[PDB]
């Protein structure tokens, strides 16, 4: 009655792989916050959205990864009843706010490029939007703590374990277990994917159908190509990284054949690692590729 995770050959590898992700996430996501605070000319409404995304992804490394890994490797919860109701609530809060601020950036870019004759949003409106994002994600993460319980499980006369598991009001095959999974995928994945794909398609079309006066029309198109390469990476990374994690949970709630496998915990860790690669990929695409942050890093390092 043992899995593959008990072997030290795979147990040592997982810790080293998780450590590198943590090491890269803390360094990358803190530089963006540092330059905004240090430089007083970088305090712009557009740059506040990116700084918010850095803070949200910082919590994912600090909370989602180390707490998940220890519960998987040790096999039981040894943190206390108080953390059983709190750690799952915080992890869902960080994931939702990270996704919400990702579609705000896409809509901000859509507004100021397609409609280039309007007025930029003010600081007061931005603070309301940032504040609303944390407030709504706090409400949506409430069911995690409500339907979580702490118990002692004794199977063998001496096999007592501690489990922080989730239970639902329904009995036998409860639909509420699968209702949450469908709502999670159709709100955290399907809705954001449609918005950012629609927003970036209109941006690509408008830039392409633009002619500059004079003989410098060609030079504009050389710089246009690199923007197209940048727009695709944002959509592809988000869709690929977060798909297997959401699909795996929905499969479990539909079919019980997934649960009774010898390698269930090994499969979950692989999909969890892929989804957590966006913690360090976000500062690389948003906080390093744009010209405003790129020149601030070089200036501040001197």
């Amino acid at each position: 009655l043992i899995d593959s995770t008990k072997l030290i050959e795979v147990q040592v590898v997982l810790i080293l792989a998780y450590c590198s992700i943590i090491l890269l996430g803390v360094i990358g996501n803190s530089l963006v916050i540092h330059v905004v605070i240090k430089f007083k000319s970088m305090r712009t409404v557009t740059n506040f959205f990116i700084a918010n995304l850095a803070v949200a992804d910082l919590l994912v490394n600090t909370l989602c990864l180390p707490f998940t890994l220890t519960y998987t490797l040790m096999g039981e919860w040894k943190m206390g009843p108080v953390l059983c109701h709190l750690v799952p609530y915080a992890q869902g809060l960080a994931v939702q706010v990270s996704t919400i601020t990702l579609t705000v950036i896409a809509l901000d870019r859509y507004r100021c490029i397609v409609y280039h004759l309007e007025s930029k949003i003010s600081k007061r409106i931005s603070f309301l939007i940032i504040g609303l994002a944390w407030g709504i994600s706090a409400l949506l993460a409430s069911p995690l703590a409500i339907f979580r319980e702490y118990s002692l499980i004794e199977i063998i006369p001496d096999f007592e374990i501690v489990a922080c598991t989730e239970k639902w009001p329904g009995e036998e095959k409860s639909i509420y277990g699968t209702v949450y999974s469908l709502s999670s995928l159709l709100i955290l994945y399907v809705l954001p994917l449609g918005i950012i794909s629609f927003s970036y398609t209109r941006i690509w079309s408008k830039l392409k159908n633009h002619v500059s006066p004079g003989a410098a029309n060609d030079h504009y198109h050389q710089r246009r190509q690199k923007t197209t390469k940048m727009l695709v990476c944002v959509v592809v990374v988000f869709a690929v990284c977060w798909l297997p994690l959401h699909a795996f949970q929905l499969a479990v709630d539909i079919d019980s054949q997934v649960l009774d496998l010898k390698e269930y915990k090994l499969i979950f860790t692989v999909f969890h690692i892929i989804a957590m690669c966006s913690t360090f990929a976000n500062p690389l695409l948003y906080g390093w590729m744009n010209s405003n942050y790129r020149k601030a890093f070089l200036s501040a390092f001197r």
Binding site: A163, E166, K265
Partner: peptide, 25 residues
């Protein structure tokens, strides 16, 4: 519900252990 009960019996134990020790993120 623990099975409390041979090859198919161990399948239920593995299914039960994976159910309680389950994560979402």
């Amino acid at each position: 519900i623990k099975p409390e009960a041979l090859n198919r019996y161990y399948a239920s134990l593995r299914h039960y252990l994976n159910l309680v020790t389950r994560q979402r993120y």
